[PDB]
């Protein structure tokens, strides 16, 4: 029952072996969800499930620099379901964010923004009921 859009500060930025866990439930008839790992106004890693992009469900990932979106990376494996509870785990590895949903590996996103210690907040937005958002070291 956290309020969305939600800002999760990441004190001191991200570092390899930091694991972010998001628990929530997708709203009925959802259209979109987004996670935004932010470096100030820049978005180092945008993770964006789209439930109806031309009648397809797709995960779009990208980076926003100086207000410009870059090259999209797309994944048609789509583990989210309207009305149902999910877990997203984002593990920071040296060279990528590694994302698992409901305990199944989903995708990796190579670091475009390389000042990891400056990626010091995570925004969570879109068509979910947000249960919890936290981090720990593994
Ligand atoms: C040249 C051009 C034209 C169109 C577009 S479309 C754009 O694509 C981005 C990824 O490349 C990103 O998804 C962006 N976006 C989504 C949300 C968003 C906000 C609240 C909830 C949510 F679930 C998602 N905020 N910004 C979207 O507007 C991009 C480039």
Swiss-Prot record:
Superkingdom assignment:
Eukaryota
Alphabetized, the UniProt keywords read: Acetylation, Cytoplasm, Differentiation, Disulfide bond, IgE-binding protein, Immunity, Innate immunity, Lectin, mRNA processing, mRNA splicing, Nucleus, Phosphoprotein, Repeat, Secreted, Spliceosome
GO molecular function term, any single one: RNA binding
Q: Please list the tissues where expression of this protein has been recorded.
A: A major expression is found in the colonic epithelium. It is also abundant in the activated macrophages. Expressed in fetal membranes.
Keyword check for Phosphoprotein: yes
Metal-binding: is it a keyword of this entry? no
| Binding site residues for a beta-D-galactoside | 69-75
Please state the protein's primary subcellular location: cytoplasm
Q: Where in the cell is it found?
A: Cytoplasm; Nucleus; Secreted
**One cellular-component annotation, GO:** extracellular space
GO biological process, alphabetically ordered: eosinophil chemotaxis; epithelial cell differentiation; innate immune response; macrophage chemotaxis; monocyte chemotaxis; mononuclear cell migration; mRNA processing; negative regulation of endocytosis
Q: Which residues carry this modification: Phosphoserine?
A: 76
Pinpoint the Galectin domain residues: 6-136
As annotated in the record, motif Nuclear export signal runs over 114-129
Its quaternary organisation is: Probably forms homo- or heterodimers. Interacts with DMBT1. Interacts with CD6 and ALCAM. Forms a complex with the ITGA3, ITGB1 and CSPG4. Interacts with LGALS3BP, LYPD3, ZFTRAF1 and UACA. Interacts with TRIM16; this interaction mediates autophagy of damage endomembranes. Interacts with cargo receptor TMED10; the interaction mediates the translocation from the cytoplasm into the ERGIC (endoplasmic reticulum-Golgi intermediate compartment) and thereby secretion.
Name the job this protein performs: Galactose-specific lectin which binds IgE. May mediate with the alpha-3, beta-1 integrin the stimulation by CSPG4 of endothelial cells migration. Together with DMBT1, required for terminal differentiation of columnar epithelial cells during early embryogenesis. In the nucleus: acts as a pre-mRNA splicing factor. Involved in acute inflammatory responses including neutrophil activation and adhesion, chemoattraction of monocytes macrophages, opsonization of apoptotic neutrophils, and activation of mast cells.
Q: What is this protein called?
A: Galectin-3
What organism does this protein naturally occur in? Answer: Homo sapiens (Human)
């Amino acid at each position: 029952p956290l309020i969305v859009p939600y800002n999760l500060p990441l004190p001191g930025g991200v570092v390899p072996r930091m694991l972010i866990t998001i628990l929530g439930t997708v709203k009925p008839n959802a259209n979109r969800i987004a996670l935004d790992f932010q470096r100030g106004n820049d978005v180092a890693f945008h993770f964006n499930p789209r439930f109806n992009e031309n009648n397809r469900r797709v995960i779009v990932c990208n980076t926003k620099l100086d207000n410009n979106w870059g090259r999209e990376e797309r994944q048609s494996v789509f583990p989210f379901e309207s009305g149902k509870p999910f877990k997203i785990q984002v593990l920071v590895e040296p060279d990528h964010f590694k994302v698992a949903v409901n305990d199944a590996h989903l995708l990796q996103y190579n670091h475009r923004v390389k000042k990891l210690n400056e990626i010091s907040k995570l925004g969570i937005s879109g068509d979910i009921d947000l249960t919890s958002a936290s981090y720990t070291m593994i």
